[PDB]
Antibody, heavy 220, light 212 residues
């Protein structure tokens, strides 16, 4: 059983966007499909629901008259058509099913898709190394990282050594700078003895601008 | 709209403690209540369905109970991996409503941060801007004070902080502070320092470098 959302991204105020929720491992005709959203740093808010077999739908008062939910049963996919988007509609949008023997709760959720309602435009991130130095050591342990700066909209993902380095990694929550652009650092603590011997590369991904950067972090 | 009044908003407890989160439904919803656990940056996961049934695969330390319009989620023995925001949800009537959420933090022994300072890269300086980063790694409690000093002058309004969510294994936090200056302003000074004040430190720790 899997729910996979797509279609999220940057849209101007007053604009329109259609989210998709591709289901697999079950038939959407047998369950109800819900849309639940979450504004940055806020709680969960149910948005809409559909019974795909007969198309009966229900909406939250906050989206009524602007959002429409629908389904293509042959494609096993549900949709969220959003018209007249407002700044307050900026949120991660999740789809969910009401399924099982007698659960009648949301047992399976999708990963979510971020929708940013803003008049600002797309900026890829600038990636710089946070080089390990004598000022970045602490008794056999060094810190190094990458500064992922001046991007819009969210999100960016960071990994180290294509996913082979995960322990000691800290990718900080992005912060909005005064310029209206996001910034974050991803750091990792490693053995000091590994500095001139192990290779460290941060893999940055910014899907909103189709950017993928692999920066090698060398000591100096 | 049937309100789900969740309490408390935040909660802090030691490993092994019995934690109780309550949701008072403003109306009778019989047993049509579910509980979800949400880890940072992840989708909510179902814990309890039908007010008291444990969802398959969820650890036995989680339990749900109904008492009229009040519902409870109990973690009998709080583990470090239980750091998350918990949400109740009624599905008796449309709209299905969620509680405001409960942020559960794990109490642990005091841990001083390891402090690291990072000068701006030559690549960024070439591009005409300078970001200086100070890292406070794996500390507890979350409360920490970071001050920037550029040639002993206390900086104000030119830095931003970011704090990681509590670690699921060691219950610590990490903090980054970024000081931003133009390349021109940056080259007018020599010592860039970050002074850290934390409960685990006897006296404030200073990490610094001399430009060049």
């Amino acid at each position: 059983v899997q729910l996979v959302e797509s279609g999220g991204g940057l849209v101007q105020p007053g604009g329109s966007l259609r989210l998709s929720c591709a289901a697999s491992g079950f038939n959407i005709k047998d369950t109800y499909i819900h849309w639940v959203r979450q504004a940055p740093g806020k709680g969960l808010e149910w948005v809409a629901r559909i019974y795909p077999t007969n198309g009966y739908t229900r909406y939250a008062d906050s989206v009524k008259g602007r959002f429409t939910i629908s389904a293509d049963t042959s494609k096993n996919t549900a949709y969220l058509q959003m018209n007249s988007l407002r700044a307050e509609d900026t949120a991660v949008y999740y789809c969910s099913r009401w399924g099982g023997d007698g659960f009648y709760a949301m047992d399976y959720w999708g990963q979510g898709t971020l929708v940013t309602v803003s008049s600002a435009c797309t900026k890829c991130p600038s990636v710089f190394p946070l080089a390990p130095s004598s000022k970045s050591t602490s008794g056999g342990t060094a810190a190094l990282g990458c500064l992922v700066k001046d991007y819009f909209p969210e999100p960016v993902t960071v990994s180290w050594n294509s996913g082979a380095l995960t322990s000691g990694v800290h990718t900080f929550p992005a912060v909005l700078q005064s310029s209206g652009l996001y910034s974050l650092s991803s750091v990792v603590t490693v053995p000091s003895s590994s500095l001139g011997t192990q290779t460290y590369i941060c893999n940055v991904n910014h899907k909103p601008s189709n950017t993928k950067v692999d920066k090698k972090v060398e000591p100096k | 709209d049937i309100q789900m009044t969740q309490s408390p908003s935040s909660l802090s407890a030691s490993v092994g403690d019995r934690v109780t989160i309550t949701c008072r439904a403003s109306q009778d919803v019989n047993t049509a209540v579910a509980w979800y656990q949400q880890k940072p940056g992840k989708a909510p996961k179902l814990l309890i369905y039908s007010a008291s049934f444990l969802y398959s695969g969820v650890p036995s330390r989680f339990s749900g109970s109904r008492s009229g319009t009040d519902f409870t989620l109990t973690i009998s023995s709080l583990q470090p991996e239980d750091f998350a925001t918990y949400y109740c949800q009624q599905h008796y009537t449309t709209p299905p409503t969620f509680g405001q959420g409960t942020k559960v933090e794990i109490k642990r022994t005091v841990a001083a941060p390891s402090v690291f300072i990072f000068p701006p890269s030559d690549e960024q300086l070439k591009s005409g801007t300078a970001s200086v980063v100070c890292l406070l790694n794996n500390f507890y409690p979350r409360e920490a004070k970071v001050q920037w000093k550029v040639d002993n002058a206390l900086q104000s309004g030119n830095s931003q902080e970011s704090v990681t969510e509590q670690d699921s294994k060691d219950s610590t936090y990490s903090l980054s502070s970024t000081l931003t200056l133009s390349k021109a302003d940056y080259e007018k000074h020599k010592v860039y320092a970050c002074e850290v004040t934390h409960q685990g430190l006897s006296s404030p720790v200073t990490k610094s470098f001399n430009r060049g």
